[PDB]
Amino acid sequence: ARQNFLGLVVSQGKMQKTVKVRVETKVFNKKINKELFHRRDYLVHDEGEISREGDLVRIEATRPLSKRKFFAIAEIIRNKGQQFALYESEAQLSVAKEEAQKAKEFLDKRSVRENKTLLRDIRTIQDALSGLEVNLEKQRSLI
């Protein structure tokens, strides 16, 4: 059948409709007597641009598409590079909302302290006149 390999995307977007896929195979080295891996980087055709660095993909043989590109993306085994891209794009603003409300809370407590004397009040009333412990008691009670 058409040659099929399993690989990991390394470079994406440097090119137009082309990616680089690291492919690993097993070979017996008689000299050192070891079943060792060998690596090669394939220039592979990406059409639709559905590839991202760090994706596990299956690459399949095709007609010669350029001087050095004889394979095309067949299936995204795992889309972890796409996950990275989406999570970056989301995070850039997801953190931003929390930062904004944190700044609001910080300045609000600044103002609350700015309004702040009661030792005068407390003393005036005396002239006429632990929460974590309770949480511990709750935990002990349930245990």
């Binding site: 050192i32 007597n33 070891k34 079943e35």
Partner: protein
């Protein structure tokens, strides 16, 4: 399943034999347990016991993640006629170079041929092969036509 842990166990048994200690301990993992059972069934080890780091267990204890860290397998060593029964123990498949043999080459090894620079089986020797996460004697592995990784050599 570390070949590193198994190698450490092999060296520990060798050292324990050389200084003539009756009872010692090894990590309580299924690879170690299967190894100890196969050595014991072949007469190399006197006995297997469950235990902790301090010593063998007095009463039965269930194995849970709570106590797994300190669990140990206590092996008793045999010394007969002022000699150690488990004289030597080696790893054929090093963590670097792992040797996975098909059944035909195991038969060749048992028949005296050197395959992948492995010195073939000797008369009083024992070779263990792991196939599909089960340890077994090489002879039984051939008997069941199971492809597997050759692990070790205890003589």
């Amino acid at each position: 399943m570390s070949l590193v842990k198994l190698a450490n166990t092999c060296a520990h048994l060798q050292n324990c034999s050389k200084v003539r200690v009756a009872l010692t301990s090894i990590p309580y993992t299924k690879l170690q347990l299967q190894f100890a059972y196969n050595l014991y069934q072949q007469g190399f080890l006197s006995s297997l016991q469950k235990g902790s780091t301090m010593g063998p267990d007095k009463d039965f204890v269930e194995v849970t993640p709570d106590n797994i860290s300190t669990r140990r397998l206590w092996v008793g060593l045999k010394y007969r006629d002022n000699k150690p029964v488990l004289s030597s123990c080696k790893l054929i498949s090093k963590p670097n170079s792992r040797i996975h043999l098909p059944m035909e080459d195991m038969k060749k090894l048992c028949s005296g041929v050197t395959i992948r620079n492995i010195k073939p089986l000797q008369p009083g020797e024992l070779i263990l092969v792991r196939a599909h996460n089960n340890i077994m004697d090489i002879n039984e592995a051939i008997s069941k036509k199971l492809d597997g990784e050759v692990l070790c050599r205890v003589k």
